[PDB]
Structures are given as structure tokens and as C-alpha cells.
Design a protein around this nucleic acid. Structure first.
Lengths: 320, 151, 47
DNA sequence: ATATATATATATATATATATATATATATATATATATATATATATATATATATATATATAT
DNA sequence: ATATATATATATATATATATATATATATATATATATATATATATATATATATATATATAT
């Protein structure tokens, strides 16, 4: 379909004139600011404390003072860092939240773009095709409701695994070549890293939904009993909004203690293997080593972020 | 021994799945979760085109360098053959080079690429595909293998 | 780690004047061009 | 015997003018960015000025 | 032992004055983009000329 094509131009004009990331990319000083921000958050576990961030930013400013054409300050690093950080918060690029600072989704996308723009390592690896093949293999074998097809698929899979077991019993096994392992490690890192990319879009979904709820209530005459069911209706509405729905299923899976613990153990043994150190620098390996911890804590943070809207029912209903 | 144990548990897992399926208790993806599970494979595989978009450019630049260098009067025939072999091997050594090489290795056992294409054809027929992807995205994924081969 | 914090800014600065995509995105008239091109290439995988 | 000369109309290529369309460079006009000045929010004071309540007195 | 009346210290609020950082309104320089002049390149229309396959007529 192509009827929307007329409207898409207006949509893109909107995005250009308002969206944070795009506006950032158009600034005369875009690369310097984006690089500074990238470096700042490149070391984060979670939201960084305001003063830790201030120190790091002031130090980084010192490193780039030689770029004098941009009116970069040359006599006061802490004041400059504070001014710039305040401005960036004004740019809707980072959040005045809980004494810490987090990367707005706009910053996430701008980082992904520019960091994926120059001459670099590509977004893929030689192992991507194998992963896609396995994923399609599972997607088809599970979408197919014909039980006959499913049982036949299992009959052949079990035979393949039986071949493998017999081969190993006879004393023959196979392992990855070094560079093959390098590519697989890079593939793992590329995949798992994307899991973090959308938490703070779900956060914004909750924020916008809650602000829309409170905004529509400007009809002070509204029969307040509606919220007795709207308490469930908001949850249902966001449980079909792909953000909240997918995040809820993600939590449902994230609660499988055995699977997450096993995946962490496997990640540990993978990072231990020598090839790991070659595929990734120490920073990336440290990031991946505790990844499960990061996901757990970020999900819990987003939960306690939606928490604000949860109590809003009584704040709306009651008076006295 | 560790591989043996892993396979011994995986075989038991799949045998349990077979027992359940034979019991008539086969299970499908929640028809609604199918939309997201298909969007997953689409987004995942969308990278490959963005990668060949650069494999092509790398090899083009290698060829242009070989041209502008072969002009060199200092170069003699033995220099030229050596430079050809070295340039091609070095290009193949870079990450994108290994991507290309793996894709090529897939072709030697085309059975797998054709099986993937057939499966994708089946997948996009299922009704949920229409919700996940418009006609354009389905048009791409249905012929991703062909678009790679051509590229 | 430290090396990158200084070398990377060069990569972005160069990309801001070397890579066509970023050069385009900063232009006054970017969305019109991007939309029109998308529409052209939307319907024909062959060119 | 078969082979030959020039002469014809045949299509094709070439020189030249017409306007147009494209490319390069200059100038003007426009918009982003950052600087400067004013005022306001924030912190501290030297001291006034104070309320509260304790520590505290009184009663039986 | 309880129940009230007792003088005052502790802690606190606040004030004009100072200063300092943040926010708003402005001006000027840099960069962008469009427009224009001019030159130059493209292609087309017209007519001339080139060369070609065959015609018409001749050779030993």
C-alpha cells in the first residue's frame, strides 16, 4: 500500500522539527557533543550519579579544549561541564531523574546510528546466517499446527541428534576454529546488547500513557466511578500496546530462574575461553559478563518507574 | 564427555516433546505472539543486506586499488600476481570477508539456503504475517536469499 | 579506553563531512528528499 | 568464355546553425550558533528577632 | 506519689546585604542555500558531401 506516502512527508517534517536525535544530528557541533555523551555513558552500569557524570564530563572537556573554534571554555572545566549538562537536559536528551542520569531513547538511537556510520566493524558476522537459519527452523516448526508435520519434524531432529550422540560415543567430536569462535562471540554480543536498547522506550510509553490519562481528566465533572474499571483498562490498553505487552512477556520469561542462571553460567565459560579476549576488548567483556544483572536491575527500575502511575488511581479519585 | 552429556539431555528433551506431540497435545505459538516472533526474525535478518552493502564496496575499493597500483612502472609481472593474491586474501581475511566466505560456503550445500527460502515462503503465508509486516517487508524477506545471491 | 576517547572524536568529525548520509541529514531540506527517495525505492527492489 | 569499366541511386556521415540544458562560479539573502547584558534563584551572612519547649518551679 | 506554673535555652525564622549560578532577551559572525550570469556542452534540424551496392555497358 502507498496511500500513506503523501502523509509520510509531513510525518518526516514533524520528526525533523521536533524529535531530539534528529535535531541533534543537524547541529553545527553535533559530532563533538555526541562523542562526549557516548564516552560519558560508555562506562555506565545503570544511571550514573550526577556528580560522577559531572567529573567525567569536565575531564572530557579538558581533553577537547583544543577545539577552540567552537568557543570551548579554556579556564573553568567544572562550570563548563555543569552548563553543558544542564543544557543537554534542556535538550530533552538526558533525564533529571532520581539524582542519576539515564540516556534518553533519542540518545540511544543517535548513538546507534553514528556509531554504526563510519568505517568500523559491521553490525553482522559470518555466524548471522546460522542464527537466522536456526530461528526460521524453530519459527516454522512451531507455527505449523499440523501435528503430523510436528511429529515428523521431531522424528528427524531426534535422528540427527542420535547421529551426533553416536559420533561422540565413538570418540569423534567437533569444535569451532578460532576465528569462527571470534565471529560467534561478536554475534552473541551484538544480539544480547540489543536487549537493552528499548527499556527507555517502554519507560516513555508508560510516561505518555499516564500523562494522557491525567490530561484527559481535565473534565473535572467526570463520574469518578469509571476508574474502578479503568484501573484494569489502562493495563489492558498497554498490554496490547506492543511496548507494554512485549515487556510483560519479557518479564514473564525473565523470571525463569533456571534458564537465566544457566545462560549466565554459559556466558561465564564463554568469556573465560581464550578466543573471547580476542573478539572483544575488556570493556565489552565486562559489559557482557554481568549482563543478566543489568537486565534484571533495569527491568526492576522500569517497574518502579511505572509504579508512579499505579498509585495515580487514588490520586485521581479522592478528595477531602 | 561434556558434549555427550549435553546431547544426552537434548535427546531426552526432544523425546519428551515427541511424547507430548504424539499425545495430541501439540502446542502452537500464541497466535498473537506470532506477530512479534516474526518481527523478530525480520529485524534480525535485516542486517545481512546492510552488511553486503559494504562487502561490495570493500571489494570495489580493492579492485580500484589494484588498478591504480598496476600502473606502477616499478611493478613487474611477479609483483602483479603477488599483489593480486595478497589483496584478495587480505580482503577475504577482514570480517566482511568472512561474512562473504560463509555465505559462499552455504551455497556449496545449497540444500540449507533453499530450505530456508521455502520455510520463509511458508511463514509469510500464515495470517499473522500480514499484521507484523506490510507487503514490502514480506516482499523482502520472502526473497532475502535471492537478494543476497544477486548482490 | 583512553586512546578511543580522543581518537573517536576525529572519526565523528570526519564522518560529519565525509559520509553522505550524515551530510544529507543535516541539510535544510532533508525530510523531503528522504521521503521522496524512500517512495521511489519502496516499490522496486530491482532499481 | 568469364570478367571488367564507369555511372546511378542508395544510405550514411559530416559541417553548421538553432535553441536548449547543464555546469561552474559569484553574490545576496537567510538561518544557526555563540556572545553579552539583565534579571532571578540560590547560598551565606551579622544580626535581629523569635517560638517553642526544655528544663524546670510550684502546689497538694 | 501526682498535677500544675515556672524561668529560661535551644533551636529557629527571618532580614538586608553581599555574592554567584541559571535563565531570558538581545547582536554579530559563520555557514547554508538559492539565485543569477556566464560559459559551455547536447542534441536536433538542414543541407552537403562520402562512400556503396548495384546498373549499364564493354573486354580477349
Amino acid at each position: 500500500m502507498e496511500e500513506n506516502t503523501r502523509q509520510r512527508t509531513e510525518n518526516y517534517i514533524s520528526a525533523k522539527n521536533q524529535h531530539p536525535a534528529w535535531i541533534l544530528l543537524a547541529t553545527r557541533r553535533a559530532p563533538l557533543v555526541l562523542s562526549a555523551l557516548k564516552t560519558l555513558f560508555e562506562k555506565s552500569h545503570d544511571g550514573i550519579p550526577l556528580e560522577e557524570a559531572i567529573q567525567s564530563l569536565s575531564s572530557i572537556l579538558i581533553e577537547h579544549v583544543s577545539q577552540e573554534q567552537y568557543d570551548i571554555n579554556q579556564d573553568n572545566p567544572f562550570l563548563q561541564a555543569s552548563r553543558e549538562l544542564r543544557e543537554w537536559i534542556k535538550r530533552r536528551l538526558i533525564v533529571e531523574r532520581d539524582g542519576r542520569i539515564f540516556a534518553t531513547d533519542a540518545l540511544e538511537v543517535a548513538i546507534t546510528f553514528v556509531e554504526s556510520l563510519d568505517n568500523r566493524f559491521m553490525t553482522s558476522t559470518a555466524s548471522r546466517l546460522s542464527t537466522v537459519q536456526r530461528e526460521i527452523e524453530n519459527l516454522e516448526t512451531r507455527l505449523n499446527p499440523n501435528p503430523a508435520n510436528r511429529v515428523a519434524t521431531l522424528r528427524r531432529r531426534i535422528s540427527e541428534l542420535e547421529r551426533e550422540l553416536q559420533e561422540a560415543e565413538a570418540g569423534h567430536i567437533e569444535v569451532l576454529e578460532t576465528h569462527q569462535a571470534v565471529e560467534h562471540i561478536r554475534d552473541v554480543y551484538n544480539l544480547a546488547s540489543s536487549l537493552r536498547a528499548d527499556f527507555r522506550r517502554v519507560e516513555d510509553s508508560w510516561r505518555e500513557a499516564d500523562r494522557a490519562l491525567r490530561q484527559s481528566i481535565i473534565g473535572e465533572q467526570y463520574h469518578r466511578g469509571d476508574i474502578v474499571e479503568r484501573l484494569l483498562n489502562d493495563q489492558d490498553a498497554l498490554l496490547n500496546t506492543p511496548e507494554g505487552r512485549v515487556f510483560d512477556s519479557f518479564q514473564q520469561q525473565l523470571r525463569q530462574s533456571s534458564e537465566l542462571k544457566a545462560m549466565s553460567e554459559r556466558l561465564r565459560v564463554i568469556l573465560s575461553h581464550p578466543s573471547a579476549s580476542d573478539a572483544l576488548n575488556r570493556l565489552q567483556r565486562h559489559d557482557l559478563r554481568w549482563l543478566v544483572k543489568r537486565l534484571v536491575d533495569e527491568s526492576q527500575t522500569v517497574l518502579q518507574a511505572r509504579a508512579r502511575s499505579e498509585r495515580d488511581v487514588r490520586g485521581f479519585m479522592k478528595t477531602g
